[PDB]
Scaffold this active site. Structure first.
Site, PDB file in Angstrom:
ATOM      1  N   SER A 203      95.212 -68.501 -21.129  1.00 13.41           N
ATOM      2  CA  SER A 203      95.561 -67.088 -20.931  1.00 13.41           C
ATOM      3  C   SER A 203      95.259 -66.658 -19.491  1.00 13.41           C
ATOM      4  O   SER A 203      95.813 -67.220 -18.545  1.00 13.41           O
ATOM      5  CB  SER A 203      94.823 -66.198 -21.952  1.00 13.41           C
ATOM      6  OG  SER A 203      95.067 -64.818 -21.751  1.00 13.41           O
ATOM      7  N   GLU A 327     102.991 -67.099 -29.466  1.00 11.58           N
ATOM      8  CA  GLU A 327     102.203 -66.503 -28.391  1.00 11.58           C
ATOM      9  C   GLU A 327     102.026 -64.981 -28.515  1.00 11.58           C
ATOM     10  O   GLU A 327     101.157 -64.398 -27.871  1.00 11.58           O
ATOM     11  CB  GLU A 327     102.818 -66.858 -27.028  1.00 11.58           C
ATOM     12  CG  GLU A 327     102.818 -68.348 -26.691  1.00 11.58           C
ATOM     13  CD  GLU A 327     101.467 -68.841 -26.190  1.00 11.58           C
ATOM     14  OE1 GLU A 327     100.564 -68.004 -25.975  1.00 11.58           O
ATOM     15  OE2 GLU A 327     101.302 -70.069 -26.013  1.00 11.58           O
ATOM     16  N   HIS A 440      97.748 -66.935 -30.317  1.00 11.55           N
ATOM     17  CA  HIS A 440      97.300 -67.159 -28.945  1.00 11.55           C
ATOM     18  C   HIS A 440      95.847 -67.637 -28.905  1.00 11.55           C
ATOM     19  O   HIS A 440      94.954 -66.951 -29.401  1.00 11.55           O
ATOM     20  CB  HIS A 440      97.429 -65.837 -28.177  1.00 11.55           C
ATOM     21  CG  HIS A 440      97.478 -65.987 -26.685  1.00 11.55           C
ATOM     22  ND1 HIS A 440      98.370 -66.811 -26.054  1.00 11.55           N
ATOM     23  CD2 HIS A 440      96.758 -65.368 -25.717  1.00 11.55           C
ATOM     24  CE1 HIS A 440      98.186 -66.720 -24.737  1.00 11.55           C
ATOM     25  NE2 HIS A 440      97.221 -65.856 -24.515  1.00 11.55           N
TER      26      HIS A 440
HETATM   27  C1  LIG Z   1      91.767 -65.505 -24.540  1.00 16.10           C
HETATM   28  C2  LIG Z   1      91.459 -65.233 -26.006  1.00 16.10           C
HETATM   29  N1  LIG Z   1      92.109 -63.985 -26.556  1.00 16.10           N
HETATM   30  C3  LIG Z   1      93.209 -64.485 -27.469  1.00 16.10           C
HETATM   31  C4  LIG Z   1      92.780 -64.731 -28.910  1.00 16.10           C
HETATM   32  C5  LIG Z   1      91.044 -63.199 -27.325  1.00 16.10           C
HETATM   33  C6  LIG Z   1      91.356 -61.660 -27.478  1.00 16.10           C
HETATM   34  N2  LIG Z   1      91.776 -60.803 -26.316  1.00 16.10           N
HETATM   35  S1  LIG Z   1      93.357 -60.699 -25.757  1.00 16.10           S
HETATM   36  O1  LIG Z   1      93.244 -60.183 -24.444  1.00 16.10           O
HETATM   37  O2  LIG Z   1      94.026 -61.928 -25.949  1.00 16.10           O
HETATM   38  C7  LIG Z   1      94.223 -59.483 -26.747  1.00 16.10           C
HETATM   39  C8  LIG Z   1      93.707 -58.053 -26.806  1.00 16.10           C
HETATM   40  C9  LIG Z   1      94.196 -57.045 -25.960  1.00 16.10           C
HETATM   41  C10 LIG Z   1      93.703 -55.744 -25.996  1.00 16.10           C
HETATM   42  C11 LIG Z   1      92.699 -55.420 -26.898  1.00 16.10           C
HETATM   43 CL1  LIG Z   1      92.083 -53.807 -26.954  1.00 16.10          CL
HETATM   44  C12 LIG Z   1      92.190 -56.382 -27.753  1.00 16.10           C
HETATM   45  C13 LIG Z   1      92.697 -57.674 -27.704  1.00 16.10           C
END
Ligand SMILES: CCN(CC)CCNS(=O)(=O)Cc1ccc(Cl)cc1
Ligand SMILES: CCN(CC)CCNS(=O)(=O)Cc1ccc(Cl)cc1
Ligand SMILES: *[C@@H]1O[C@H](CO)[C@@H](O)[C@H](O)[C@H]1NC(C)=O
Ligand SMILES: *[C@@H]1O[C@H](CO)[C@@H](O)[C@H](O)[C@H]1NC(C)=O
Ligand SMILES: *[C@@H]1O[C@H](CO)[C@@H](O)[C@H](O)[C@H]1NC(C)=O
Lengths: 535, 533
Positions: A203, A327, A440
């Site tokens: 990511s 994804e 993801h």
């Molecule tokens: C790298 C790992 N990830 C993917 C699983 C963990 C989670 N975080 S995330 O950024 O992918 C998605 C997300 C976005 C905004 C909010 Cl408020 C909450 C979650």
């Protein structure tokens, strides 16, 4: 010393370390957790580039993970494993610039290839201390050296007022680079070869691996790279100077605050006060968009990634890139109405419509229309099940799948050796509903080899599968080629070329070579919409 | 004097001719006039009914072919010449043909009226492919085919004028339709069971007789083969029609009245010689003198009319062929010939897209190229060739057909959809063209049954099946032989299931969605693109 394990005592440039003998199912491993690589970026050092850690007196204890960088915590699903597994598992502090090292027990005789992990979490979250980033299995089973840093995230890592001295931005990427130099200088005292450093991340982490490839000073600190479900080029991984400036000034207002006298006020603010207003500076109601991310500053990034990936020379670069099957399913429950992990998320065409404006917040109504028209199944344009599966595919293709193919194509055209995969195996341990498929970040627990932990209740096939992946990743780290040289009977994994566009499936079954990585649907996203949106 | 070959109609007496079909004799009445000759001051004017005649009229030969452009591209080539006039050109066109069985029906027999095609610029009822003898002999059909004024003579308009009001070629059809209402019973035809069926420009014509109220009293069923009233090529606006007419006048040396006047003082070929020079852009599948939205015959655009219509008792049969675009590529697009293989570059592909869709902006053209390119092999000249053909066929025929089939069904009509996928063993065009525009026709009319044509023994059976479908439709508004089973059955096209069948040597195969995704691009997106900009 005297009465201690003599094999857990190592000296680095800052001083002496007392590590720890960890147990893995197949034997012991050496771990050094909480090694500071920088001066604590606090007080007047907030928003600033990292300075090297002042050398300490005595022996530093390196048996526990150190603090997690200050960040936003998920409140959506309390006590739900599928969210908590990514949540901070140590105390939150701006004092968080520590790295961890894993090594065999005893430490290796010959110089041993290094694996450096950069976590994801959209530049607003993440920690190297999470159970899914446990380097104990790679070190035990593959005999690898594994480093994983903590970098500053969100406001503290990426708030910028471009052109300023007091907040030049991109400092979280500087934290990462300082850790790469640390490895160059210190990794030998662990049996690590600082001439065989492979970067890998997921990511936002995969994105930053990309940015180190595109940033010159970082190009001396590694030799190969892996980008898992993330890219420097794309919709979310970067902002302009103006846009970063805008989000910083806006945040200052929301918390109560000439760039100097502005930031000076920001430094008088409690860290939570900045975290609690972080999501409020997004210009549109969005998903897969993050407030404080790397900025195009004409320093760390001389131009835009797209510019850089189009012009640049990658003659002797080896990259491993890939995506998981779904994804986008993850992000839908965090913004798109109609979506939740507790029902099947069957939506109406009206909800699919609103979601497209959310998943693609930078689209005019016409571009949005184009998206709706492309993803609609005109044989069943009102089928709630299809609309649901297509909503995730919009978000997936737009943010990861197509930028990756865009990247895997440019690199492979400008000299780089590129291997590509699709990760298709849904963990039997998955706590998310089935409709989310392979979400993801759920290949991660297989690269790090967690199914080897017998307490985790995986399957025998999931064990072997995890084993097979660690091979690919490690073989690639030392050779630049995931293929085992001995074993030629089993299927091979060809480089992704512009010509044939081959990539492999990663599942409980042997390798399957496929051509074209969403070729048609990506020429839509990558060639057409930018032209359309130009007017 | 064969009393079977003797018919009395509202204008006088006719003597037909007894024709030989391989399975029996048929009665044919060829050259029957349904209108006063549209010559001199009758040019560009609505037709008048034919004045009565004395004695017995000779209806044993095809009359003259309406004056039109004749193809010079492939002289002697039987794949182009088969569409060329087989009679003599004259403005004395307005005659029609009638086939009935021999002896004529003892009972009122359903009528099929063929309206030929040829882009509103050419065509004739006397072509051998339109030989209505087989349908009459084998299915027991009363078959009618008329001539109608084409090109300038049928469609040059100066809207609002009394002396060039437009759509006169369409009014010729309407008159021949009224003629059938009045005189068909004499031959044994049921005037309460009349079915229109046409191809290309004729399918369009058929579509407009559906969209024009005065025509709706003249038939009960329609068949549209590879053509629609809606679409890019079938109509023009009043502004554009006025434009082309005014321009043509300038080209030949010529106020409304004072302009149409000088035009009548011109030899026919002097108008034909400049027929194409009035097209606004270099195009293909675009015609200079076609029907025009006058507010009369066409109250509004076909689109606006199909979007609001009520077809709750209409029955339609629509369809396309496999390669609706191959024909038009050799007629303008660089790189294309029927004599090589027309493997093309990419610039050549973009060049053609600009011509196949001359209406497109830079961006919409790009949108076409992007959609049709196979990114796995985006430089494969074999796919690029097949795609250039597909851009043209879908833009001009397939998607308009799908658009119409959907609206009719949605608004109450009972519609049946097909696709013709068989390529004739006798086809003289190259293989890369596959099944080109107009090659279902040999089979609907039953030409395979002529043993001299050297069709195969299965192509013979296939033709008999289609003739069955077409006639069954005419008799019932349902293509299904009510004596069969299992095959399966040809189901109505719906907005829901979007089912249609394929026509080849194998039994009926039901499919769903007619280029559903590719047409949404044409029908839904590209307008909004240009509609914006
Ligand atoms: C790298 C790992 N990830 C993917 C699983 C963990 C989670 N975080 S995330 O950024 O992918 C998605 C997300 C976005 C905004 C909010 Cl408020 C909450 C979650
Ligand atoms: C019965 C209708 N067709 C179908 C094959 C016969 C002739 N073909 S056509 O007129 O439709 C296409 C065409 C267009 C422009 C030129 Cl210059 C020549 C031909
Ligand atoms: C699924 O959950 C969300 C949130 O509660 C809700 O908006 C939606 O109506 C639910 N769908 C179904 C099928 O119950
Ligand atoms: C698997 O083992 C048992 C099954 O009942 C259970 O107690 C344990 O918690 C499970 N492990 C996990 C974390 O899924
Ligand atoms: C096909 O014919 C055209 C026109 O003569 C010509 O330009 C082209 O070279 C030919 N294409 C080939 C040889 O594939």
């Amino acid at each position: 010393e005297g009465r201690e394990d003599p094999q857990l005592l190592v000296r680095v440039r800052g001083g002496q370390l007392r590590g720890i003998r960890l147990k893995a199912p197949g034997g012991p491993v050496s771990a050094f957790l909480g090694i500071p690589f920088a001066e604590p970026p606090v007080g007047s050092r907030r928003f600033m580039p990292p300075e090297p850690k002042r050398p300490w007196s005595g022996v530093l204890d390196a048996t526990t993970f150190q603090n997690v960088c200050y960040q936003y915590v998920d409140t959506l699903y309390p006590g739900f494993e599928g969210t908590e597994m990514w949540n901070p598992n140590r105390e939150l502090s701006e004092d968080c610039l520590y790295l961890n090292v894993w090594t065999p027990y005893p430490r290796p005789a010959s110089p041993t290839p290094v694996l450096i992990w950069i976590y994801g979490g959209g530049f607003y979250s993440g920690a190297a201390s999470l159970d899914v980033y446990d380097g104990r299995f790679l070190a035990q089973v593959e005999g690898a050296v594994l480093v994983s840093m903590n970098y500053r995230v969100g406001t503290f890592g990426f708030l910028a007022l471009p052109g300023s001295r007091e907040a030049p931005g991109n400092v979280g990427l500087l934290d990462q680079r300082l850790a790469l130099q640390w490895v160059q200088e210190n990794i030998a005292a662990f049996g690590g070869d600082p001439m065989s450093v492979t970067l890998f991340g997921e990511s936002a982490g995969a994105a930053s691996v990309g940015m180190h490839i595109l940033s010159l000073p970082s190009r001396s600190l590694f030799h190969r790279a892996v980008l898992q479900s993330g890219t420097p080029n794309g919709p979310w991984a970067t902002v302009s100077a103006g846009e970063a400036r805008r989000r910083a000034t806006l945040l200052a207002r929301l918390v109560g605050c000439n760039d100097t006298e502005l930031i000076a006020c920001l430094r008088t603010r409690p860290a939570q006060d900045l975290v609690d207003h972080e999501w409020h500076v997004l210009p549109q109601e969005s998903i897969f968009r993050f407030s404080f991310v790397p900025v195009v500053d004409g320093d760390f990034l001389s131009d835009t990634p797209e510019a850089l990936i189009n012009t640049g020379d990658f003659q002797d670069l080896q990259v491993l890139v890939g995506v998981v099957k779904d994804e986008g399913s993850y992000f839908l429950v965090y913004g798109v109405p109609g979506f939740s992990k507790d029902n099947e998320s069957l939506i109406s065409r009206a909800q699919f419509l609103a979601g497209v404006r959310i998943g693609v917040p930078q689209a005019s109504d016409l571009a949005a229309e184009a998206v709706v028209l492309h993803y609609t199944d005109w044989l069943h344009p009102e089928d709630p099940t299809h609309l649901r599966d297509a909503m995730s595919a919009v978000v997936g293709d737009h943010n990861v799948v197509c930028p990756v193919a865009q990247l895997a194509g440019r690199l492979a055209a400008q000299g780089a050796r590129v291997y590509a995969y699709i990760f298709e195996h849904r963990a039997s341990t998955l706590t998310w509903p089935l409709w989310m498929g392979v979400p993801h970040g759920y290949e991660i627990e297989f690269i790090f080899g967690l199914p080897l932990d017998p307490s985790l209740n995986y399957t025998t096939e999931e064990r072997i599968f995890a084993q097979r992946l660690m091979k690919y990743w490690t073989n690639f780290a030392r050779t630049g080629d995931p293929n085992d040289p001995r074993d030629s009977k089993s299927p091979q994994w060809p480089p992704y070329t512009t010509a044939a566009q081959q990539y492999v499936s990663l599942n409980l079954k042997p390798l399957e070579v496929r051509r074209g990585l969403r070729a048609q649907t990506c020429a839509f996203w990558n060639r057409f919409l930018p032209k359309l949106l130009s007017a």
